[PDB]
Symmetry: C2
């Protein structure tokens, strides 16, 4: 709400992400993050994916998160659109579902008819593709290794967690989820890949208030990853686990 | 042009202003600055005006800088509008001219007819007045002393310099001014109180490119003040004086 306030908040975020050290200087991680034109949590998870051996997947995920409407859901074809979407649904959640969508598009030869059949916006995937190429070019310039996790997608989940631990939520016994940061009651959106399999712990990309305070893009986590990637930030009960 | 880049730049600014120490922690100055909803250079000069004994004037100046069109200049009354404006012109420049305008408005009983006579936008002064009251309320909450410099307006110039040293410019022998920060050729606007008395050294509020790269709101400085208020930032030849 004021230049100084938001600057201080952003500085604190950088420290917790590992971008700044105890003396407030940029770390190697911070320097690398700074080369990308993304918001800091996205930069963090991209760099970490290099260390976690899943930068091939993360480049795609980051690009998919940077575009708007990937799926469309016509009023008269809702069950069909949901059926086609659910085929992409991954058990680990929304980020890996976005990866699945992009990879399928690629494997089906970047086909507009295929996008139409599956209720996917071809224009959004094309923009995602452009962004990915840009991000890959930055990776290559600064010798940041691009590798795939293959079937070991737990490494993708961990990388997301290393960036978005601040957005951790634990399932509430009575209703929805409670955020760890300030105990806000939040919910998994009906469109989420996790809506019918709501796990104990998640991180979310962002919060959006519509019908309820909804989490947008949720990924399943192990609570121990919070301590692994943000050991100063969490207490084995700051915020309890 | 990217979240990380602009954040790093803003952090560097805070350090040079004295808002952050060598370990990147908020100083007493930084903590005080953070209570105001202004851009950091404005916050700096407001806090410093407390130490320099001119916070009465600075509250007014900061409020006047926070509003849009104070003077108006009708096409058919240009010489008259300029004549009425020049009556407010202070030898030290634009910031002290803004102070003179507000104080005269007050001394003439906040009169709309008076504003009309002098080609001043009454609505802009009213908004400036509202902002001043808000800023004064923040000063009072945190026990930041409000005092006047009286006739010793050099203290106002020094306070401006302590905040805006980054925007220092030295007069170029051949044409206009050269900024100290990156040697950009810049000019005093025809509307400035300093246009017909262009001094050796100035600081400016901002740069605006119109007909030329124009400095907007210039105040005369002594180059020694740059060393006084930013001793690590300037060389007695970083940037030469
Ligand atoms: Br690193
Ligand atoms: Br983000
Ligand atoms: Br888009
Ligand atoms: Br102070
Ligand atoms: Br400013
Ligand atoms: Br205004």
């Amino acid at each position: 709400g004021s230049p100084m306030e938001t600057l201080i908040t952003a500085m604190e975020q950088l420290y917790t992400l590992g971008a700044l050290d105890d003396e407030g200087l940029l770390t190697r991680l911070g320097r690398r993050m700074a080369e990308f034109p993304l918001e800091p949590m996205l930069c963090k998870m991209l760099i970490m994916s290099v260390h976690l051996g899943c930068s091939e997947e993360m480049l795609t995920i980051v690009s998919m998160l940077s575009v708007q409407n990937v799926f469309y859901r016509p009023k008269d074809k809702q069950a069909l659109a949901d059926q086609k979407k659910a085929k992409f649904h991954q058990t680990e959640g929304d980020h890996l579902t976005l990866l699945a969508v992009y990879n399928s598009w690629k494997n089906n030869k970047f086909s507009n008819p295929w996008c139409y059949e599956n209720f996917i916006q071809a224009r959004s995937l094309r923009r995602a593709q452009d962004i990915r190429k840009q991000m890959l070019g930055i990776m290559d310039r600064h010798k940041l290794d691009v590798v795939s996790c293959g079937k070991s997608t737990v490494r993708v989940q961990k990388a997301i967690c290393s960036g978005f631990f601040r957005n951790a939520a634990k399932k509430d016994p009575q209703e929805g989820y409670r955020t760890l940061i300030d105990q806000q009651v939040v919910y998994i959106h009906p469109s989420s890949a996790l809506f019918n399999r709501q796990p104990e712990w998640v991180v979310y990309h962002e919060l959006v208030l519509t019908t309820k305070e909804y989490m947008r893009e949720v990924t399943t986590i192990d609570p121990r990853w919070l301590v692994e990637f943000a050991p100063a930030f969490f207490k084995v009960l700051d915020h309890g686990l």
